UniProtKB/Swiss-Prot annotation:
The gene is acs. This is Acetyl-coenzyme A synthetase. The lineage of its organism: Bacteria, Pseudomonadati, Pseudomonadota, Gammaproteobacteria, Enterobacterales. It comes from Salmonella typhimurium (strain LT2 / SGSC1412 / ATCC 700720). Monomer. CoA binds at residues 187-190, 307, 331, 519, 580. GO terms for cellular component: cytosol.
Length: 634
């Protein structure tokens, strides 16, 4: 079944089928002309000359776009919208508790960003410094990010769900001088500790770069205070001048970094610059959500994830849109919360994730009970594969069969959408991301690197660069080159697998490396195993993912205890909490399989293929298989 483009969307769409084909063709054959013209969607302090100047050469990757043009992301997302839209709402904030909400106008957001920018500067923050941001879903998070960008300070946002240990690891690597957090976050009626986590993270003897901690009082809970180091958000911003002139930043000046899990090692600091990134974010956001001035847009992705950076704040603010930042979860107090918010603020564009959709779908009509949903015109999905059933449920129950669904595939390393549908230009196939965006050249290659044509499948790679592509891994360009450009020479390897149908539509099946997808979260198997083995009683571990009807994949961990140790309710609880404390609750195993027989190869390496099978329900010592099979049966 191929969903047709609705007449209402066809009558106002920015891009129709004919225009998609044409623009796409030019973006591929002549990217300098295409991107040269399209980069004007942003205001440039000094125009650029060169457009595309990239190379995927082995051990010699170089990615630059609009390299000689200078601009300011904050000015593009705020200042240039004041004169004609200063009164227009920039951010709609919906508290965890519906009785709490805010409507921050562009003029207001701009004023606060200016005051906070001066705050950072008066504190000693300069262009190039890294500022760690450990914040919940509140306006202050966007103010902190925009202020950092405004002065050229590279921000390092850290998802509130990361543990103290995980936070320390990010600060150590980035050598952040400042940490901006809140006393506590509020999520689903509960108060999540944030400030205390920073104190704990700062006790790590390896953390030496942090000199100050700005704290936002969100709950007013009793917290420990370190005079001199810690400072209240309210006290600082109120002393700062609301007068701040944006300075020119180079197109390739670092904008921010996001620590992302990889097949091996601990999370790396994916780094994005300013020009190409902002151009790509505003262009993708605009065309894929078919944004028209006046549209109420709502991305549910957390500010701590790339989706939050690109489609909650930057992409939509750059286009002068009204973006909604929700503080809690889609089904709290009830599964109909998400739709209640939609009606409350007349949302026209909803962009959420398959996990949330599945969790709501599990509640049947209770998710749309008592709600209208008529204000919606466009629906979007991101983060993980979505099966036809969930896609149709979303399309029918949430979109009332009137809104096209945009399943956007991309990664932290791509900055923005790569393979996605365009509402008024591409007919939809439930579960399919469809065709590649402008400037994106996808391809399927076998494990040997040979391209595969026609209806086929294989490793998903991008044969060329695009404006929003990550420029490197903080402090480790070599790892950047090896991780993404060594598997298949001269090509970007996403680590994903996908098939292409008879029509040329792409279907992403999932990671082909050892990266897991837990409730729409990217986590490496290796990092979970290291965390486990770090426990004084754990000798060795092997982690695999298993299918889960709601969260996509559950974490199944095979654990080998040192000699003299024995399984017990207490140790079962200690190990799970060890991972929660080492990485965070998101990486907490749902299953612990105690075994003294891990499958391995004569060389010593562990074979996770056979482990993945058993865990789901399906050679130095083939005996381990039979033993493993039974331990699992128990
Ligand atoms: C059920 C639903 C509301 C939340 O599912 P979830 O993402 O698995 O999160 P859960 O509520 O199950 O949380 C699991 C654990 O993570 C923690 N956690 C999740 N988000 C957190 C946050 N922002 N800050 C702190 N802790 C967080 C919880 O406290 C919990 O730990 P605990 O049991 O030890 O207290 C889901 O339907 C949803 O909306 N998920 C969206 C998440 C996502 O995929 N985002 C990417 C969008 S692109
Ligand atoms: C883009 C939001 C999250 O970014 P992250 O860097 O955390 O994770 C990117 C990975 O999420 C999956 N993924 C993302 N979007 C989709 C999608 N739309 N369909 C299927 N899988 C998807 C793909 O496997 C990809 O390697
Ligand atoms: Mg150990």
């Amino acid at each position: 079944h191929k969903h047709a483009i609705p007449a209402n969307i066809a009558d106002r769409c920015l891009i129709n089928p004919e225009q998609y084909e044409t623009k796409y063709k030019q973006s591929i054959n002549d990217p300098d002309t295409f991107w040269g013209e399209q980069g004007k969607i942003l205001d440039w302090i000094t125009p650029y000359q060169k457009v595309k100047n990239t190379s995927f050469a082995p051990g010699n990757v170089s990615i630059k776009w609009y390299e000689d043009g200078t601009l300011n992301l904050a000015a593009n997302c705020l200042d240039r919208h004041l004169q004609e839209n200063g009164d227009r709402t920039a951010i709609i904030w919906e508290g965890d508790d519906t009785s709490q909400s805010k409507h921050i106008s562009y003029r207001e957001l701009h004023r606060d960003v200016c005051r906070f920018a001066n705050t950072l500067l008066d504190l000693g923050i300069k262009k190039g410094d890294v500022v760690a941001i450990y914040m919940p879903m509140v306006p202050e998070a966007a103010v902190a990010m925009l202020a950092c960008a405004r002065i050229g300070a590279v921000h390092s946002v850290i998802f509130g769900g990361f543990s103290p240990e995980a936070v320390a690891g990010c600060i150590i690597d980035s050598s952040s001088r400042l940490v901006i957090t809140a006393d506590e976050g509020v999520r689903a009626g509960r108060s999540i500790p944030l400030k205390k986590n920073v104190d704990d993270a700062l006790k790590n003897p390896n953390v030496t770069s942090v000199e100050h901690v700005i704290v936002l009082k969100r709950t007013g809970s009793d917290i420990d205070w370190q005079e001199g180091r810690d400072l209240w958000w309210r006290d600082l911003i109120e002393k700062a001048s609301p007068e701040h002139q944006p300075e020119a930043m180079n197109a390739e000046d670092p904008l921010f970094i996001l620590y992302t899990s990889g097949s091996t090692g601990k999370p790396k600091g994916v780094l994005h610059t300013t020009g190409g990134y902002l151009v790509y974010a505003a262009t993708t956001f605009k065309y894929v959500f078919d944004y028209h001035p006046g549209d109420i847009y709502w991305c549910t992705a957390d500010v701590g994830w790339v989706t939050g950076h690109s489609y909650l704040l930057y992409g939509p603010l750059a286009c002068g849109a009204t973006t909604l930042m929700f503080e809690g979860v889609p089904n709290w107090p009830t599964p109909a919360r998400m739709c209640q918010v939609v009606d409350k603020h007349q949302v026209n564009i909803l962009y959420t994730a398959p996990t949330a959709i599945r969790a709501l779908m599990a509640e049947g009509d209770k998710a749309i009970e008592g709600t209208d949903r008529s204000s919606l015109r466009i629906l979007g999905s991101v983060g993980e594969p979505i099966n036809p059933e969930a896609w149709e449920w979303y399309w029918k129950k949430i979109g009332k069969e009137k809104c096209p669904v945009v399943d956007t595939w991309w990664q932290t390393e791509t900055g923005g959408f790569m393979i996605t549908p365009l509402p008024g230009a591409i007919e939809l196939k439930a579960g399919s991301a469809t065709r590649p965006f402008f400037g994106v050249q996808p391809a399927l290659v076998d494990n040997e690197g040979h391209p595969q044509e026609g209806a086929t499948e294989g490793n998903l790679v991008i044969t060329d660069s695009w404006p929003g592509q990550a420029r490197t891994l903080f402090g480790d360009h070599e790892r950047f080159e090896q991780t993404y450009f060594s598997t298949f020479k001269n090509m970007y390897f996403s680590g994903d697998g996908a098939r292409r149908d008879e029509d040329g539509y792409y279907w992403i099946t999932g990671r082909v490396d050892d990266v897991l997808n837990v409730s729409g979260h990217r986590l490496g198997t290796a990092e979970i195993e290291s965390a486990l083995v770090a426990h004084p009683k754990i000798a060795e571990a092997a982690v695999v993912g298993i299918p889960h009807a709601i969260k996509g994949q559950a974490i199944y961990a095979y654990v080998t205890l040192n000699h003299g140790e024995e399984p017990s309710p207490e140790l079962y609880a200690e190990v799970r909490n060890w991972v929660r404390k080492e990485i965070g609750p998101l990486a907490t195993p749902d299953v612990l399989h105690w075994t003294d027989s891990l499958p391995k190869t004569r060389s010593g390496k562990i074979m996770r293929r056979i482990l993945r099978k058993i865990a789901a329900g399906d050679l130095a010592d083939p005996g381990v298989v039979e033993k493993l099979l039974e331990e699992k049966q128990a």
